[PDB]
Amino acid sequence: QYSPNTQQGRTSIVHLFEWRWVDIALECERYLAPKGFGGVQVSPPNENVAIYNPFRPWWERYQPVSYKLCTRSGNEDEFRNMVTRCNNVGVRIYVDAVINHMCGNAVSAGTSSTCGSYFNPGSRDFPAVPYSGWDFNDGKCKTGSGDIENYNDATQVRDCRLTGLLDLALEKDYVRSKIAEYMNHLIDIGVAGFRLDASKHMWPGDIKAILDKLHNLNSNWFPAGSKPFIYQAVIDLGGEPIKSSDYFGNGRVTEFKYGAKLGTVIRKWNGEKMSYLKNWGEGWGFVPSDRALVFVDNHDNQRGHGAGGASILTFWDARLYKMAVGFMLAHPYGFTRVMSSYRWPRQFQNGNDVNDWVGPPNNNGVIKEVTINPDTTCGNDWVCEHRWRQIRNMVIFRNVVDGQPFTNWYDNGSNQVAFGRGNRGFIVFNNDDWSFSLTLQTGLPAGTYCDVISGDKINGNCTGIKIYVSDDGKAHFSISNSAEDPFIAIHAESKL
Numbered sequence: 001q002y003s004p005n006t007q008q009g010r011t012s013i014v015h016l017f018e019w020r021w022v023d024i025a026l027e028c029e030r031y032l033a034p035k036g037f038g039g040v041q042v043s044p045p046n047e048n049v050a051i052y053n054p055f056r057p058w059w060e061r062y063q064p065v066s067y068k069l070c071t072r073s074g075n076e077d078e079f080r081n082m083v084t085r086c087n088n089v090g091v092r093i094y095v096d097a098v099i100n101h102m103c104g105n106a107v108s109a110g111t112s113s114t115c116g117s118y119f120n121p122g123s124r125d126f127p128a129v130p131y132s133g134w135d136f137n138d139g140k141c142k143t144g145s146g147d148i149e150n151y152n153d154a155t156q157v158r159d160c161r162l163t164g165l166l167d168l169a170l171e172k173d174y175v176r177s178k179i180a181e182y183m184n185h186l187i188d189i190g191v192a193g194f195r196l197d198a199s200k201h202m203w204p205g206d207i208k209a210i211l212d213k214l215h216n217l218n219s220n221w222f223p224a225g226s227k228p229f230i231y232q233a234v235i236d237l238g239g240e241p242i243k244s245s246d247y248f249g250n251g252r253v254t255e256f257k258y259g260a261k262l263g264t265v266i267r268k269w270n271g272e273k274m275s276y277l278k279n280w281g282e283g284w285g286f287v288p289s290d291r292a293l294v295f296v297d298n299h300d301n302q303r304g305h306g307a308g309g310a311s312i313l314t315f316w317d318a319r320l321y322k323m324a325v326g327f328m329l330a331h332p333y334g335f336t337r338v339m340s341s342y343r344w345p346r347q348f349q350n351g352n353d354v355n356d357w358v359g360p361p362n363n364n365g366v367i368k369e370v371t372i373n374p375d376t377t378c379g380n381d382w383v384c385e386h387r388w389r390q391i392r393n394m395v396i397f398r399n400v401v402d403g404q405p406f407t408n409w410y411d412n413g414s415n416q417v418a419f420g421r422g423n424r425g426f427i428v429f430n431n432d433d434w435s436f437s438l439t440l441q442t443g444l445p446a447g448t449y450c451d452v453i454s455g456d457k458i459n460g461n462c463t464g465i466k467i468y469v470s471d472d473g474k475a476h477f478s479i480s481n482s483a484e485d486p487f488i489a490i491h492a493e494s495k496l
């Protein structure tokens with residue numbers, strides 16, 4: 001189950017949030033492949049309801065109308081074209097599968113859908129699938145509102161509507177078959193796996209029944225007998241009757257405590273300090289590394305929503321963000337996902353962002369293409385964190401040190417720490433309010449290494465800082481507390 005199915009050597013996937021299929025295909029060939037990224041998580045590719053109030057929010061894509069591959073990101077031809085082009089270059093595609101529900105019960109009937117399909121939430125008729133009132137949990141849910149009201153009741157969380165979203169009867173073989181039909185369509189096209197949206201709201205057993213009906217991965221790109229990579233979106237911060245471990249039988253699970261706690265530590269809140277990261281991992285109560293999908297932020301919580309709370313680090317806090325992502329990519333715990341977002345007119349009022357609903361850059365609803373600037377950055381309001389030198393070079397760092405043990409740990413008892421990965425990589429952080437100047441044991445072969453955070457190695461040259469490792473593995477590091485990027489990283493492949 002639990003294998004990402006990426007090409008040997010590639011260790012991360014990127015979430016190209018709300019990107020168009022055609023732009024992802026180009027990105028795979030011009031950037032992702034040559035830069036060593038393992039794969040891409042795409043936004044839901046199935047038809048959703050077009051919500052005009054507010055104007056085309058990002059969350060309308062989490063309200064299915066049918067399973068036709070027709071959305072603002074593109075049609076089926078473009079989707080197939082993207083998967084093929086990306087697979088041919090060694091970059092995998094993972095689909096965000098919204099299978100727990102359909103749209104909001106209070107949405108008006110009609111054809112306000114991304115593909116014009118007709119649907120009637122009131123009568124619970126989605127003829128494009130087709131689903132009828134007999135395919136929902138209206139009869140199971142026993143709350144007054146028909147919605148989930150108490151999260152300390154596991155049954156309610158599974159059988160009632162998540163915020164009014166029509167809850168599918170996943171125990172019915174008919175429903176399981178329709179969903180499996182959709183997922184097999186994607187698998188045969190070439191997708192390598194799925195993010196199972198709202199997994200906490202589904203019974204582990206139903207998810208299993210659906211996975212039993214799936215084909216093996218397309219034999220043109222994957223070894224025979226390959227199984228799709230499955231990671232279930234379960235928000236478990238502890239304290240609930242539902243535990244992420246209840247889903248280990250189906251695949252990996254998203255570890256939301258990861259970004260929440262790392263954000264608190266980097267921000268140095270709640271008395272937390274970087275020296276405490278010495279036992280980062282299961283030691284902090286996270287799920288086993290072999291079942292974890294980790295990230296600093298995701299599409300939901302970077303908007304202040306979702307759970308980690310106010311500790312979540314985002315591209316808005318660029319300096320601290322790069323450090324957190326840098327630490328995640330260097331640490332052996334779990335399988336890493338990098339976020340790639342778009343900017344929106346954030347407007348707080350009483351601590352809340354009233355524009356947290358805003359969708360991707362657009363011209364009257366039409367998603368704007370991702371343009372690339374001369375300096376390799378993106379235009380049209382796409383942030384492209386995956387193109388930031390500090391992030392992109394750490395994605396490569398993880399590939400280079402893959403398999404190496406966590407060793408040579410150092411800390412000053414405060415917020416200055418360093419550690420290596422075998423004899424293939426070393427990284428140093430300074431998050432204290434004073435300079436860091438020290439000679440440390442790196443465990444690396446003697447030589448001149450390019451610091452990949454401040455620069456790049458380009459044919460025997462470094463465009464940034466150079467680190468000198470002596471015959472005994474010692475190297476001196478200097479990091480001002482007022483430095484742009486208060487951390488340095490070198491590895492086997494940045495050596496001159």
Ligand SMILES: [Ca+2]
Pocket residue numbers: 100157158159160167168201202
């Ligand atoms: Ca449910």
Ligand SMILES: [Cl-]
Pocket residue numbers: 233254298
């Ligand atoms: Cl997620």
